[PDB]
Enzyme design. Structure first.
Site, PDB file in Angstrom:
ATOM      1  N   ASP A   1      73.940 -42.516  21.292  1.00 14.38           N
ATOM      2  CA  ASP A   1      72.621 -41.712  21.237  1.00 14.38           C
ATOM      3  C   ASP A   1      72.865 -40.867  22.770  1.00 14.38           C
ATOM      4  OD1 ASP A   1      72.307 -43.389  19.517  1.00 14.38           O
ATOM      5  OD2 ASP A   1      70.305 -44.083  19.626  1.00 14.38           O
TER       6      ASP A   1
ATOM      7  N   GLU B   1      71.950 -37.591  24.584  1.00 10.36           N
ATOM      8  CA  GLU B   1      70.730 -36.537  24.168  1.00 10.36           C
ATOM      9  C   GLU B   1      70.969 -35.972  25.554  1.00 10.36           C
ATOM     10  OE1 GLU B   1      67.140 -38.946  23.384  1.00 10.36           O
ATOM     11  OE2 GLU B   1      68.328 -40.442  22.471  1.00 10.36           O
TER      12      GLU B   1
END
Length: 858
Positions: A131, A133
Site C-alpha cells: 500500500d 500511497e
C-alpha cells in the site's frame, strides 16, 4: 468471490472483547508493516508512528509496545475457525515513508524484498500486500516521491513475485502478491498497470475517500455509481481500470467502514451537492460504529439515500456525512457479481458496529446465489404491548429492526401489513425514531371489542417495497404480542420425587403462575404415577434407591398442591407426562386407537389428582434422544395428531366442567428437534411451548462453552443461545406469545480445562471426574467460595466459574440471578408468553425464582 478485510495493528486482538469472526471473509490483511532502513518491520518499530505529535504521551507509550507479535499469532490462529483463510501483511498505508528509497536501485529493492519475505515467513503469512500511497506524486507531498517511482514500482513488484515463486517451487505453497491502488486518474498515470498486473493476484481498488471536506461541495465518498458527471464512484474507477486493460477478475472493489464529513454546509436541500464552508473544526471522519451509536437517525441527523449513486448520507442542517451502510454494501456486492470482479475489500474491520453488521452484510450478499432473491428479514426490539384491563389497550409501539434489507428512510403505510390488531384499534407504521433500520408499529390506545383473556398474536409483514435493495421479497410474518392484563407466565417445574409436605422448603405460589409437576408416565398406553414406571423405579440396581422410587410421595404431593391451589386460586398446576428417558409415546402416538386410549387415560389422570392441564414432555420424537427412547419417523406427524386430539379432549373437558384446561409441551433447542416436530402445525393446539433453552453443551463434548446463555457469545459465532433458539422457533412460524424461555437451576461443566481465558471456549481433557449437574444449591455449598472465581461473558450475558486447581482446571457454566434477569428481560422485550425453569428443588434460597419474578412481574 474474495473478501479482503483490513485488520489494524493498533488494536490488541488477544485482549479484544469481541475478537474477529474470520468465517465472514477470505483474506485478512494486517495493516501494517512499515519500512525502516530499507527493511520491512513491525509498526512498533516505526518511530514516525510511535512518536506522532497529534494524540501524544499517554497514548504514545502504548504505541512503543504495540503487541504485533501477539496480534499476528492471534490472527493466523483464526485458521482453526476458517481453514481456507489467508492472512497477508500489508506494507505501507497512509503517510508511510520509505517506498521511494526502498524501490530506487536493484540493491535497495533486493534488501526490501528479502525482508518482506522474512516478515512473511516469520509470522506464517500467506502473501504480501503493498500500500504505497502513492508512487511519483507522493500524495502531493505527504511522502517522498520521484518520477522514477513509476518504473521502480514495476521492478519492485517483479522482484517480489520472483522470490515468492522461487519459494513456492520449494514449499509447494502458492503466495499472494497484491496492491492497494488509488482510484484517481493521477494514480493510473503514475503506475504501469499492464506491466504490473501479471505479477499480482489482484488489485484492491481504494474506492473510498473519493470526495471529502477538501472539496468545495458535498458528495459521496465511496458511492457505487456516479449520479453526476463530476462525482467519482466505484463504477467510474472500475471503468477507468478496465479501460487501461486490467482484467475484471483481478479488481477488488473497496468499501469503507467510516464516513467522510463536511461541516458548515449550506442548509438547502438534503445537504448533498451543497457548498461547504470551513472544515477547520472538522473531525474529517467518523467510524461506522459511532455513526450507529450517535448519528444514523439520531441526535438531529436525518438519513437520506441517493437512489442513483446508491449511497447513504446524513444531514442535520449543518454537518453532512457520507458513509457506507447495509444498502450500499448490497449494491456494491451486486456490482461485483454483475461485472465479474474479483471481490470486496474493506477498510477496516474494527470500525464496524460491535455485531459486525457491515462485515456480515457483505458476506451474506456476496455469496447470495442469483435468481434466489432474498427476503427481507426482521428481528424484534420491542415486542410486547400490555392490556391495562380486559378491554382497555394503552398506546404503545412494536419496534422491529431489519436484519436483511434496509428500509427507505421514510416508509409508507403500504410498505407494511400488520395483521391481528384487535377490531376497533387503529395503528400506523413508520421508521422508529432513534434506530437506523427499524419498523415501528404504533398501536393507538383503545378499547377492544371483546375481553382479552389470552395473548393476541400481531403479525408484521415488511414488504419488498419498504426496502432500498433491488430484488427482495416480502418478509416472513414477524410475530409480536398484545399481552393480557395479568402479564407473562412464570412457570416452575416441581419435582415429584421431593416430599413437599415434609420439606421445610416450600413452593412459593405467590411468585409462580404455573407449576409443572414432574412426572406422570406411560405404562401399557395408560398414564400412571412415576412410581409405576418400572424403567425409572429400577434405573438403579440398589434396593434402597428402588424402594425410595416405589414409595415416591405422589399422593402426598397431590394433597400438597391441592392446598397450594386453595391458598392461591389463580395458580395453574399441570401434570407433565414424560420427561427424560420416559417410554411409550412413539407407540401411543401411532394410530387413532392408541392416541384415543392415551388421551382418555391422561384426561382421567388429570381429573383424579386435581390438575389444571397437561404438559407433554416427549424426549424426543424421531431421534429418541439418540436411542434412549423408542422412535419412528412417523413420530413427526403423529405428534401433531396426538396434540390435535389431546386438545379436542381437553376442549370436551372444559366444556363439561365450566373451566379451561391448558395443553403444553416442553421442546428442545437443537436443530434436529426442530426438524423432527411440526412446529408451525402444533402451536395452534398449545397454550405455549416450554423451550428448554439450556443443556446446549456439556461433558459429552471436549470443549467448554455456555450451557444456557441468553445471547450468543461474540467469541463463539453461530453458537446456541435463547435468542438463537427462540429466533429459530419464530422462523418456523411459532408465535412469540406461545414461547416460553427456559432457565436452569443447575450447572454443567468440564474438568481438565486449561487455564486460558478462564477456561472459556477451551479444549478439555478426560471427563471421568466431571461435576455432572451440580444444582445451584451445590454451587452455594461447594463452589462459590472454594477457589472458583465467577466471571461474566457480557456478550452472552452468562456467568461462569473457573478454578485452576480443581481436577486439572474446572469450568462451570450456569444461570444465576443476573442471567435469569436477562432471560426475563428478553421474554418481555420479545413478546414471549413468559419464563420457565427446571427445577424448583435446585435453589432452596429462593434467590433464582426471586430474580426472575422481580424482573418479570415488576
Amino acid at each position: 468471490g474474495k473478501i479482503v478485510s483490513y485488520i489494524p495493528a493498533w488494536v490488541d486482538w488477544a485482549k479484544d472483547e469481541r475478537g474477529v469472526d474470520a468465517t465472514k471473509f477470505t483474506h485478512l490483511y494486517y495493516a501494517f508493516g512499515r519500512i525502516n532502513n530499507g527493511k520491512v518491520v513491525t509498526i512498533k518499530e516505526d518511530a514516525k508512528w510511535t512518536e506522532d505529535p497529534t494524540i501524544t504521551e499517554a497514548d504514545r507509550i502504548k504505541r512503543r509496545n504495540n503487541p504485533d507479535e501477539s496480534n499476528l499469532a492471534y490472527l493466523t490462529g483464526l485458521k482453526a475457525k476458517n481453514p481456507n483463510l489467508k492472512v497477508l501483511v500489508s506494507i505501507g498505508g497512509w503517510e508511510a515513508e520509505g517506498f521511494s528509497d526502498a524501490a530506487l536501485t536493484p540493491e535497495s529493492r533486493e534488501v526490501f524484498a528479502n525482508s518482506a519475505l522474512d516478515f512473511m515467513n516469520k509470522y506464517n503469512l500467506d502473501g504480501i500486500d503493498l500500500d504505497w500511497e502513492y508512487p511519483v506524486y507522493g500524495a502531493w507531498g505527504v511522502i517522498k516521491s520521484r518520477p522514477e517511482d513509476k518504473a521502480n514500482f514495476t521492478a519492485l513488484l517483479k522482484l517480489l513475485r520472483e522470490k515468492l515463486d522461487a519459494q513456492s517451487t520449494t514449499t509447494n505453497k502458492y503466495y499472494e502478491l497484491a496492491i492497494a491502488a488509488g482510484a484517481s486518474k493521477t494514480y493510473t498515470d503514475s503506475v504501469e498497470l499492464t506491466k504490473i498486473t501479471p505479477y499480482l493476484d489482484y488489485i484492491n481498488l481504494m474506492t473510498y475517500d473519493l470526495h471529502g471536506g477538501w472539496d468545495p461541495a458535498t458528495s459521496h465518498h465511496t458511492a457505487v455509481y456516479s449520479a453526476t458527471n463530476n462525482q467519482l464512484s466505484v463504477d467510474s474507477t472500475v471503468k477507468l481500470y478496465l479501460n487501461n486493460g486490467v482484467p475484471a477478475e483481478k479488481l477488488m472493489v473497496g468499501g469503507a467502514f467510516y464516513s467522510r464529513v463536511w461541516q458548515n454546509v449550506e442548509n438547502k436541500g438534503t445537504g448533498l451537492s451543497e457548498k461547504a464552508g470551513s472544515q477547520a473544526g472538522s473531525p474529517g471522519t467518523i467510524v461506522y460504529s459511532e455513526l450507529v451509536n450517535n448519528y444514523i437517525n439520531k441526535n438531529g441527523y436525518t438519513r437520506y439515500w441517493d437512489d442513483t449513486a446508491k449511497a447513504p448520507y446524513l444531514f442535520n442542517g449543518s454537518t453532512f456525512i457520507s458513509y457506507e451502510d447495509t444498502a450500499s454494501a448490497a449494491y456494491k456486492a451486486e456490482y461485483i457479481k454483475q461485472n465479474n470482479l474479483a471481490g470486496f475489500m474493506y477498510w477496516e474491520y474494527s470500525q464496524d458496529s460491535d455485531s459486525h453488521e457491515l462485515a456480515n452484510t457483505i458476506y451474506s450478499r456476496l455469496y447470495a446465489k442469483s435468481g434466489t432473491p432474498l427476503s427481507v428479514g426482521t428481528s424484534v426490539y420491542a415486542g410486547t404491548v400490555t392490556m391495562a384491563t380486559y378491554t382497555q389497550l394503552p398506546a404503545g409501539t412494536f419496534i422491529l429492526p431489519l436484519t436483511q434489507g434496509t428500509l427507505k428512510p421514510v416508509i409508507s403505510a403500504s410498505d407494511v401489513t400488520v395483521s391481528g390488531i384487535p377490531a376497533g384499534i387503529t395503528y400506523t407504521v413508520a421508521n422508529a425514531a432513534d434506530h437506523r433500520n427499524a419498523v415501528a408499529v404504533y398501536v393507538n390506545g383503545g378499547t377492544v371489542a371483546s375481553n382479552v383473556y389470552d395473548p393476541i398474536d400481531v403479525r408484521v409483514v415488511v414488504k419488498a417495497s419498504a426496502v432500498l435493495e433491488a430484488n427482495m421479497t416480502d418478509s416472513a410474518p414477524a410475530s409480536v404480542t398484545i399481552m393480557p392484563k395479568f402479564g407473562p407466565i412464570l412457570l416452575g417445574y416441581v419435582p415429584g420425587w421431593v416430599d413437599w409436605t415434609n420439606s421445610a422448603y416450600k413452593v412459593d405460589a405467590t411468585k409462580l403462575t404455573h407449576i409443572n409437576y414432574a412426572f406422570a408416565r406411560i405404562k401399557d398406553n395408560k398414564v400412571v404415577k412415576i412410581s409405576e414406571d418400572i424403567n425409572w423405579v429400577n434405573e438403579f440396581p440398589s434396593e434402597e434407591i428402588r424402594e425410595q422410587r416405589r414409595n415416591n410421595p405422589d399422593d402426598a404431593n397431590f394433597a400438597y398442591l391441592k392446598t397450594l391451589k386453595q391458598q392461591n386460586p389463580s395458580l395453574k398446576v399441570l401434570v407433565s407426562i414424560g420427561g427424560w428417558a420416559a417410554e411409550g409415546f412413539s407407540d401411543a402416538a401411532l394410530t387413532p386407537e392408541t392416541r384415543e386410549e392415551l388421551a382418555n387415560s391422561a384426561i382421567a389422570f388429570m381429573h383424579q389428582y386435581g390438575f389444571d392441564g397437561i404438559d407433554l414432555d416427549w424426549e424426543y420424537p424421531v431421534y429418541g434422544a439418540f436411542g434412549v427412547i423408542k422412535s419412528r419417523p412417523e413420530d413427526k406427524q403423529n405428534f401433531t395428531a396426538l396434540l390435535k386430539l389431546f386438545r379436542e379432549k381437553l376442549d370436551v373437558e372444559g366444556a363439561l366442567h365450566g373451566k379451561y384446561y391448558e395443553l403444553a409441551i416442553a421442546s428442545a433447542a437443537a436443530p434436529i428437534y426442530i426438524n423432527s416436530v411440526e412446529l408451525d402445525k402444533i402451536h395452534q393446539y398449545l397454550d405455549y411451548m416450554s423451550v428448554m433453552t439450556y443443556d446446549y453443551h456439556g461433558s459429552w463434548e471436549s470443549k467448554t462453552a455456555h450451557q444456557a446463555s441468553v445471547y450468543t457469545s461474540a467469541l463463539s459465532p453461530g453458537d446456541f443461545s435463547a435468542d438463537s433458539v427462540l429466533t429459530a422457533y419464530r422462523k418456523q412460524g411459532v408465535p412469540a406469545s406461545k414461547l416460553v424461555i427456559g432457565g436452569a437451576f443447575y450447572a454443567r461443566g468440564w474438568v481438565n480445562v486449561p487455564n486460558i481465558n478462564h477456561g472459556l471456549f477451551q479444549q478439555a481433557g478426560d471427563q471421568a471426574k466431571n461435576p455432572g449437574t451440580p444444582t445451584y444449591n451445590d454451587l452455594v455449598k461447594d463452589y462459590f467460595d472454594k477457589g472458583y472465581t465467577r466471571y461474566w461473558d457480557n456478550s452472552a450475558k452468562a456467568p461462569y466459574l473457573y478454578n485452576p486447581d480443581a481436577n486439572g482446571g474446572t469450568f462451570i457454566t450456569y444461570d444465576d440471578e443476573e442471567s435469569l434477569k436477562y432471560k426475563a428481560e428478553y421474554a418481555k422485550n420479545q413478546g414471549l408468553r413468559g419464563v420457565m425453569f427446571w427445577d424448583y428443588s435446585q435453589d432452596i434460597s429462593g434467590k433464582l425464582l426471586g430474580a426472575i419474578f422481580n424482573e418479570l412481574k415488576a
